[PDB]
Design a binder for this molecule. Structure first.
Ligand SMILES: Nc1ncnc2c1ncn2[C@@H]1O[C@H](CSCC[C@H](N)C(=O)O)[C@@H](O)[C@H]1O
Length: 327
DNA sequence: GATAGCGCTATC
DNA sequence: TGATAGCGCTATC
């Protein structure tokens, strides 16, 4: 994460739906806002949230009377994406895990928050020929909000990870917000090699495999792209090794492969997966953050979390645009 | 709840 | 195309 002094959102209240790790909280909180309610059903996710905020989120959002939700200004939600990711069987809304948006919608219709801030995977943009996006676009407009969306790729905002995501900011049609904009990109000057842990701490993640083939030679100079060096087995997901000189491929929640969820890296002549803390750092989490004691779960968690640094910017802009109230 | 080996699709 | 990537799917213990 990044430090911010113009706390644009001081005095605003926000809801953390599908809290997960709390990435949305950290982001908005670094701007001066305050989380008045949180929601996350996964037992383990609940454990870390509590471990890091002292609160335990409410359960299954689908069975929560919308009225029960407190007044709030900004609604934050990174709804489940398994049903829209390039990596899965794209069942979309037909999928049981693809209708949570409509849960967001019934929340918005009752509480009418000034802002709706959603997150999801890039393929969502084009899913079902973009019908999905369109369905969402329209649904929002009808509840009286302006729909603003773009696909930003973390590596353009200081984080050494090629995580391409769609971000959707919606404003109540009242407040004539007409100046909102998405953070301008900037030069990447921090790479994976700059986030790795001392070898002493990592050792146990190292993997020696004889079916390790080398498709390319290590690069000398830093590059803001995923430069793959090797393959293991059949080179499927989790079976590909990248250079610590480029940027980290998207971390995932349910991923498989010998280097499940983090992918493999050629660290100092050795081939290994990333340590939970390294995942955190790569997601732009402060080292102060407490990762879940169960590594498998820590991976899963960070895997479908969100790159804090980015939301930081967007939030600041969401703020900027809301404070411009001249005469 | 942990671990892995897959098999597909988008993008260009 | 031909090569890479993916907040994944699912069998097994
Ligand atoms: N019906 C539901 N009710 C509550 N939590 C749910 C849910 N369906 C999915 N979830 C939770 O939704 C989350 C989606 S991923 C969002 C993660 C969050 N932004 C963070 O920073 O990491 C997952 O943790 C999933 O367990």
């Amino acid at each position: 994460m990044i430090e911010i002094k113009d706390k644009q959102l001081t005095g605003l209240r926000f809801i953390d739906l599908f809290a997960g790790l709390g990435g949305f909280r950290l982001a908005l909180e670094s701007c001066g806002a305050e989380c008045v309610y949180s929601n996350e059903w996964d037992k383990y996710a609940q454990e870390v949230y509590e471990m890091n905020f002292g609160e335990k989120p409410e359960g299954d959002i689908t069975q929560v009377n919308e009225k029960t939700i407190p007044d709030h200004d900004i609604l934050c939600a990174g709804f489940p994406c398994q049903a829209f990711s390039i990596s899965g069987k794209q069942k979309g809304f037909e999928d049981s895990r693809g209708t949570l948006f409509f849960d967001i919608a019934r929340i918005v219709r009752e509480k009418k928050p000034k802002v709706v801030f959603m997150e999801n995977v890039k393929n969502f943009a084009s899913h079902d020929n973009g019908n999905t996006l369109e369905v969402v676009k329209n649904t929002m407009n009808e509840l009286d909000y302006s729909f603003h969306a773009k696909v930003l790729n973390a590596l353009d905002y200081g984080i050494p990870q090629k995580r391409e995501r769609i971000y959707m900011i919606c404003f109540r049609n009242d407040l004539n917000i007409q100046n909102f904009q998405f953070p301008k990109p900037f030069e990447l000057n921090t790479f994976v090699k700059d986030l790795l842990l001392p070898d002493s701490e990592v050792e146990h993640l190292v993997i020696d495999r004889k079916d390790l083939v080398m498709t390319n030679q290590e690069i000398e100079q830093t590059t803001p792209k995923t430069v793959r060096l090797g393959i293991v087995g059949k080179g499927g997901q989790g079976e590909r090794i990248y250079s610590t000189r480029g940027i980290a491929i998207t971390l995932s929640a349910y991923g498989g492969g010998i280097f499940a969820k983090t992918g493999g890296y050629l660290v100092n002549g050795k081939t290994r997966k990333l340590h939970p803390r390294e995942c955190a750092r790569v997601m732009g989490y402060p080292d102060s953050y407490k990762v879940h004691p169960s590594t498998s779960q820590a991976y899963k968690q960070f895997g479908n979390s969100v790159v804090i640094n980015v939301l930081q910017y967007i939030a600041y802009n969401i703020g900027s645009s809301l404070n411009f109230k001249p005469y």
